[PDB]
Amino acid sequence: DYLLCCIQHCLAWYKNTVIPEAFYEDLDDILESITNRMIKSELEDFELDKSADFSQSTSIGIKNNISAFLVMGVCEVLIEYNFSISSFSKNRFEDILSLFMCYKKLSDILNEKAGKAKTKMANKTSDSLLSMKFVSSLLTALFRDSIQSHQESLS
Amino acid sequence: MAQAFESCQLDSMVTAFLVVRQAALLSYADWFKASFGSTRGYHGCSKKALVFL
DNA sequence: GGCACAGGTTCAGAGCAGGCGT
DNA sequence: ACGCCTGCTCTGAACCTGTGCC
Numbered sequence A: 001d002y003l004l005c006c007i008q009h010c011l012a013w014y015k016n017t018v019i020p021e022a023f024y025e026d027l028d029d030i031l032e033s034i035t036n037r038m039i040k041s042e043l044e045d046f047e048l049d050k051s052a053d054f055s056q057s058t059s060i061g062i063k064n065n066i067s068a069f070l071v072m073g074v075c076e077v078l079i080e081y082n083f084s085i086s087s088f089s090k091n092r093f094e095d096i097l098s099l100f101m102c103y104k105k106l107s108d109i110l111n112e113k114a115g116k117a118k119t120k121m122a123n124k125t126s127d128s129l130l131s132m133k134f135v136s137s138l139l140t141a142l143f144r145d146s147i148q149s150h151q152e153s154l155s
Numbered sequence B: 001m002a003q004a005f006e007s008c009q010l011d012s013m014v015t016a017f018l019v020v021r022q023a024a025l026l027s028y029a030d031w032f033k034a035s036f037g038s039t040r041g042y043h044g045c046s047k048k049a050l051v052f053l
Numbered sequence C: 001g002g003c004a005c006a007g008g009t010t011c012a013g014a015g016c017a018g019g020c021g022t
Numbered sequence D: 001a002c003g004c005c006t007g008c009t010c011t012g013a014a015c016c017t018g019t020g021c022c
Helices: A002-018 A023-039 A059-085 A090-114 A132-143 A148-154 B002-007 B011-024 B027-036 B048-052
Strands: none
Touching: A002 A023, A002 A059, A023 A059, A023 A090, A059 A090, A059 A132, A090 A148, A132 A148, B002 B011, B011 B027
């Protein structure tokens, strides 16, 4: 999770200030691939919701709870990657939606399993890995953009 | 067969199948029902091992 | 009937109000 | 009336109950 966050943020830095030489051109495509294959991996590839019920006593449910938080963070760093590269591409905003759809499916699943026991699981209320930078620039464009060239992709 | 469905490769599967078939000449059916018991229910953890089979 | 927020309660100790030797 | 010791008052922390809602 954090490693993807690190690579993403270093990557954005590298594009922005350094460029104005094979490793980064590779890494762009690494992430693009990781996105495209993560898009169509529906938790039976990661053994979740049916093969696991994330029971925090069992070694399997605890391992599910570890890998689940990894992928939630992973999805988020890719939300960042997707948005960052492209100047408002409606394909890549659908990519962002799909990463969130995976994260949000893990969200409402872990809400179902947190609805039975007491609300002591503050591991689900662990911080996002996003630079505040991001939360600003996302919210900027979500609430304060009337630019019609962006507007179809932000809808 | 374990190696073959861990990697989900048909080459070693085909080898094992033809091996048991020539070993028969109903030992094929014996080995098949042995597979059906706690091998063929989960060849791989993913149920695409069934699709390759 | 269970699921959840708010209240008050017991604690546990810091740190100073004041009774008591010369 | 000044020095010495103690015990009381405040302060917040954590505990678990107590009651309202669906």
